[model samples]
Target: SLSSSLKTCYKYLNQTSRSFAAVIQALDGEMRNAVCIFYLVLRALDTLEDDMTISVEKKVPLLHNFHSFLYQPDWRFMESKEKDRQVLEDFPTISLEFRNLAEKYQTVIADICRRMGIGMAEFLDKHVTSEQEWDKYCHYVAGLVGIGLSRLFSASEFEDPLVGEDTERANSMGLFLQKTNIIRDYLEDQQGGREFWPQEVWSRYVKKLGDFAKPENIDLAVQCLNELITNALHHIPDVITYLSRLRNQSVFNLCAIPQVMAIATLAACYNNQQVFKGAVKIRKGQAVTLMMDATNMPAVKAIIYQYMEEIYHRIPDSDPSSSKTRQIISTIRTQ
Candidate 1:
């Protein structure tokens, strides 16, 4: 995967992780470059925070102060056992570009990095317990990414100010995806002793979070799963509103693809007990079909509408969230 002569930033962008690189590169001009640096800085910060070997004393300050490192070319992460240490080791290259960004872009990236770092630090010793707290935590990690990107979209004048201006709506864009991931990865996260599902809901189904995974509790567990699916489902109308407002084709696709994938994912997760038992995924060739078709607003709406109607088709009348889920889907359809 190594290109012998590519610039360090682009090379590292290709190297660091494969998920967001395509869409991030699909961006135009300075926005493309700005998003690349924004991603790298946050990746490096998230790496430091996630490194289990790093003592809290060391990681907390590094995280809290991570935004400042973008302005300092000399910073080094010599202590990391992290796999992506090159980003930290070669900080100067990224920092140079970070400094080179337009002042407003730098401000958006750095502010998000700082607040997200602090959010990670605060949660390092705690676990999610309530729906509000769960939203609080997701708002920190995922919603902030959506908010900052919206701000960047506005700052570049590439998108309408309303796209960036509505914090709650932008937030729904992110929380929908993050909540889907949390809901879908139930067993995998359990394997690592990681718990993101709030107890307020999970406890209604079982005594311990782990109880859901056992065969005996399968009935209870999937109901808890549906409630979460319903909550994540509630964000779709706001997401639809946000996507329709983006001005650029690249920007709209950037916003639209993940969201359609989110609903597609929710479609897969709906009433599927396989989520609690194991990994559940959208089966494809079908996945590529969705990504390719989501380039326009009409296609995006049709894709979401398709998934919603089917998920609505599968709604069990006995499930606790059935009424709320039906109402939420109807709300999106009316919108």
Candidate 2:
């Protein structure tokens, strides 16, 4: 029987994360529960890590050892942001569900958390500067997420063609999403005293990251933003190729929906001048169209192609991203 407590864990997942909840809910049975528990587990870790109200002395140790906490019964942290507080408060339920998963699923979740926790602590210990460090950070926080999902799909008997055979493509999938998030959240993160935009990229356009918020710096900010978006675009072909190889209908929907959203989001932010002012997102109506229409490869491609054309029209001729963006768009069209 699916216990009442398990239902509560899912309830919190849905309440806390709309996109992830939608994707996880679409998974087929064996993989669905495993992935849901895995996401909640990571969400709890991220909640603890992001709640800056907690002192570093306490928070760092917790992040480093978070994987071990999963093995314990009734372990819950007392500190988190107000919005994340409920998840930390009710985390015991998630832990209990985690302990109940099969051995294979348990091993994958534990291994990723153990490694990712260490990676999180390392980045916490130092600031990201170079693009290499940026990619490494994304790999830890997100690429590993892609890897874990790949393993789950494999273990669930979907036998993903790219799991071990094409980890670089898997890495690209996560990096693309992570990079877009970093680009979009620049203002929020800078104000919060957290910086994820690699200095190697941002320094080329601004004297300091906070300068991007200034009216005079908008031109340069748009230039840098376009280049970053262009870098994210490089991953689209791989993302589509990865989705195309998926055998499960539910799994394809789960993966395809997010890619479409990310592309649409990038398009909306392209040269819009809203990112520096505040948060940027695709309109709800547009998101609904994607959710309703992106059920298969052909439909997903149509959505992506539409966004690509939008970006193509908006790419500034003088901006550094123009040439690279054109080349990437050409590649996508030919393939």
Task: Indicate which candidate wins on lDDT.
Answer: 1
lDDT of 1 by residue, 146-236 (tens): 9999999999999988988999999988898899889988998898767999989898888899999899999898899889999998898
Q: After aligning candidate 2 to the native by TM-score, how far in Å is the CA of 102 from where it should be?
A: 1.0
Judge candidate 2 at residue 107 and give its lDDT.
Answer: 89
lDDT, residue 97, model 2: 90
Overall local distance difference test of candidate 2: 0.82
Q: Listing every candidate in turn, what is its Cα RMSD in Å to the true structure after a full C-alpha superposition?
A: 2.5, 1.7
Q: Number of the top candidate by TM-score?
A: 2
| TM-score, every prediction | 0.93, 0.95
39 in model 2: Cα distance from truth in Å? 0.8
Question: Residue-wise lDDT of candidate 2 within 209-288, one digit each (tens)?
Answer: 88999999899989988888888888888887888788888888877777677777788878768899888654346865
